[PDB]
């Protein structure tokens, strides 16, 4: 009896007649990669191919699942969306995911701080569960850190169907000197929790290049933990305000 989603299934050593089977167990726990599963001639073994395909069955599901509108408000958040209406057209038209709708661009200025000095933005990007699993752990303690001492903290807000370049708009609409974006990366095979931050100083839609951002990736319980991530982001925010530059052009 085997559950391919089980820890014991993921802790499975397929190597037959190993040189050092203890060494195998130390390499299997030293990583989350599917090491040490052995071979059948030049091919994978059956169970490892089974746990691969099962893990792929799960990962495909996470792609199109959305975060509730009820979850966003139970977090007390302004929810706005891009020009994309649903999850399908989002996956195929990056140009509308980088742009806010019309009722978007007015709820921004009506409901949020004018010319903040940090604007924190949260979007689902390419994975909902990157947002739900790590929120309560990253967003609260983040928000405290910028308030001490800083810093005209912009009120946070969620962008549905959001892409990384849409923060160039937000940085202008709001006039924020610095923009932070917690966004879902594309789903991995073994997990979809991975979160990233894209942070840019005084963004421009006309002028800002992709190089001008600072990126922190693999914020999750297997990568950078969200508590420590939050402490690293505000410090990053503290430095872009000192240097008045972001990403590539920082020291």
């Amino acid at each position: 009896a085997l559950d391919l989603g089980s820890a014991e299934a993921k802790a499975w050593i397929g190597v037959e007649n190993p040189h050092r089977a203890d060494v195998l167990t130390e390499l299997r726990r030293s990583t989350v990669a599917r090491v040490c599963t052995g071979r059948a001639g030049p091919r994978p073994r059956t169970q490892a191919l089974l746990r691969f395909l099962a893990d792929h069955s799960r990962s495909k599901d996470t792609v199109l699942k959305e975060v509730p509108e009820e979850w966003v408000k139970a977090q007390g958040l302004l929810e706005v969306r891009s020009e994309i209406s649903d999850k399908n057209l989002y996956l195929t038209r990056p140009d509308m995911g980088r742009r806010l709708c019309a009722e978007a661009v007015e709820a921004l200025k009506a409901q949020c701080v004018a010319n903040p000095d940090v604007q924190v933005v949260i979007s689902d990007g390419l994975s909902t569960d990157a947002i739900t699993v790590n929120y309560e752990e990253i967003l609260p303690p983040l928000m405290a850190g910028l308030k001490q001492a800083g810093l005209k903290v912009g009120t946070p807000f969620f962008v549905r169907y959001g892409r990384v370049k849409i923060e160039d708009q937000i940085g202008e609409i709001l006039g924020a000197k610095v923009v932070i974006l917690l966004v879902g990366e594309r789903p991995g095979l073994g997990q979809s929790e991975s979160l990233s931050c894209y942070a840019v100083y005084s963004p421009r839609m006309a002028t800002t290049v992709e190089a001008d951002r600072t990126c922190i990736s693999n914020i999750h319980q297997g990568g950078t933990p969200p508590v420590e991530a939050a402490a690293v982001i505000v410090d990053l925010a503290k430095r872009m305000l000192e240097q008045k530059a972001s990403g590539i052009n920082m020291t």
Binding site: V15, H19, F52, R93, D95, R186, T224
Partner: protein
């Protein structure tokens, strides 16, 4: 040149050379997203036919971006051998196709012909090419380079050991390296995609790779695929240099998006020459992929095939050890399903081989795309027949950090044992002396990373 053709008595008019190349492409979701695609399968064949009767000059004189405005267009055009150009300037794109495909065309015939070409001309040939034309034609155009392994020798097949990690943890990275070596993977490069971008993390990963390299005296080379500036400063500060990588794009606005100047590519050559532990003469490593110039708004109405071919005319200027496309690295907006991704694999490799660069391919797909692991095995084997110089390698193909799936370590062993191909001869000698390989085949004890202990 005509921009006009009659097909079933129907007139099809095209505005410029840029439109013809775009619409001559087989259907892919990126061109659709770029608004350059043909609207009918009848319009698409019309673009093929008018393209087929255009000459070399027509396309050499009509880059999708103008000379004055683009330093990549300048590099491509400035590097043309003009004697080799004048010989073929009046050939149709139909005749260049037939010339490439001919078995009366030797590799030394192509060696000179290809210097008269530009990347737009390279892409032109590719669009009037079936999947089999792309495989056979790329096969008779080997490109052989050497670092401390030789790559591209017909009858060989290399593999990059790609050990990535969510925290750049070096005990995790090292675990995947013993895994890779155990399957004969690594003769291309032991390259790590970093999750950070600071020198100190970069140099710590390099120490881990080269510590493994030094301990067993492996003939190969390490790389950390950070930005090229961070690799240069890490090597200047004393970390072991192997290959020097930079992701590239086929236009100046495409490069800017990345933060790259050509002078950094000129500097990476000089830094490698002064610092890098490379016995041979090729040290640089570039990666490409369709849809990167449109992702930056930096394609200027051109299609993603023409723009990917310019990636190659650029990289040929710096004569790198290895280039490869990450064929479905990005997502379904640019390449949708199996069909399109296989097709892109065959195009990118063929154009790279027609460009005189050491063309490999990351046979990959993302989880939000209409594909699975059987797609990778389809195209991995199609490219091995075409003499693809190298593929990637990860345990079962699962990148725990890049959150895509590439080829397994098992797949390089399968290809080699299936097609009777060897690794790099320098590297193959090492696996023999390590008991990993005998007569191109994995030994019974192979596939066990606990073997190095």
């Amino acid at each position: 040149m005509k921009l006009k053709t009659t097909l079933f008595g129907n007139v099809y008019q095209f505005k410029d050379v840029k439109e013809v190349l775009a619409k001559a492409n087989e259907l892919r979701s990126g061109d659709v997203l770029a608004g350059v695609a043909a609207a009918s399968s009848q319009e698409r064949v019309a673009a093929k036919q008018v393209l087929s009767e255009m000459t070399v000059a027509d396309i050499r004189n009509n880059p999708v971006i103008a000379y004055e405005d683009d330093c990549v267009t300048r590099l491509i055009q400035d590097d043309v051998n003009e004697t080799a150009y004048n010989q073929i300037k009046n050939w149709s794109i139909s005749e260049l196709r037939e010339y490439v495909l001919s078995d009366e065309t030797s590799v030394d015939d192509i060696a000179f012909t290809r210097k008269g070409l530009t990347s737009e001309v390279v892409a032109a040939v590719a669009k009037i090419c079936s999947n089999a034309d792309l495989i056979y034609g790329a096969k008779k155009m080997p490109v052989i380079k050497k670092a401390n392994t030789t790559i591209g020798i017909p009858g060989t097949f290399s593999a990059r050991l790609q050990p990535n990690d969510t925290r750049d943890d070096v005990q995790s990275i090292a675990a995947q390296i013993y895994e890779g070596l155990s399957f004969g993977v690594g003769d291309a490069v032991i390259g790590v995609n970093p999750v950070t971008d600071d020198v100190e993390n970069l140099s710590r990963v390099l120490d881990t790779i080269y510590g493994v390299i030094d301990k067993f005296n492996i003939p190969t080379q390490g790389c950390v695929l950070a930005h090229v500036t961070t690799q240069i400063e890490a090597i200047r500060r004393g970390a072991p240099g192997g290959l020097i990588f930079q992701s590239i794009c086929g236009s100046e606005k495409g490069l800017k998006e990345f933060g790259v100047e050509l002078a950094m590519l000129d500097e990476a050559r000089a830094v490698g020459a002064e610092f890098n532990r490379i016995a041979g003469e090729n040290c640089l490593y570039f990666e490409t992929g369709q849809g990167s110039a449109l992702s930056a708004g930096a394609n200027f109405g051109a299609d993603q095939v023409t723009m990917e071919a310019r990636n190659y005319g650029l990289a040929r200027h710096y004569d790198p050890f290895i280039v490869n496309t990450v064929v479905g690295f990005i997502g379904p907006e640019y390449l949708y399903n199996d069909r399109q991704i296989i097709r892109a694999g065959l195009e990118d490799h063929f154009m790279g081989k027609l460009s005189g660069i050491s063309m490999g391919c990351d046979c990959c797909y993302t989880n939000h795309a209409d594909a699975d692991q059987n797609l990778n095995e389809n195209l991995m084997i199609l490219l091995a027949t075409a003499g693809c110089n190298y593929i990637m390698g990860m345990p079962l193909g699962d990148d725990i950090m890049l959150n895509y799936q590439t080829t397994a370590f098992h797949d390089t062993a399968t290809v080699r044992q299936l097609l009777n191909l060897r690794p790099s001869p320098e590297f193959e000698r090492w696996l023999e002396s390590m008991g990993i390989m005998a007569n191109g085949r994995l030994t019974k004890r192979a596939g066990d990373p606990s073997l190095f202990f």
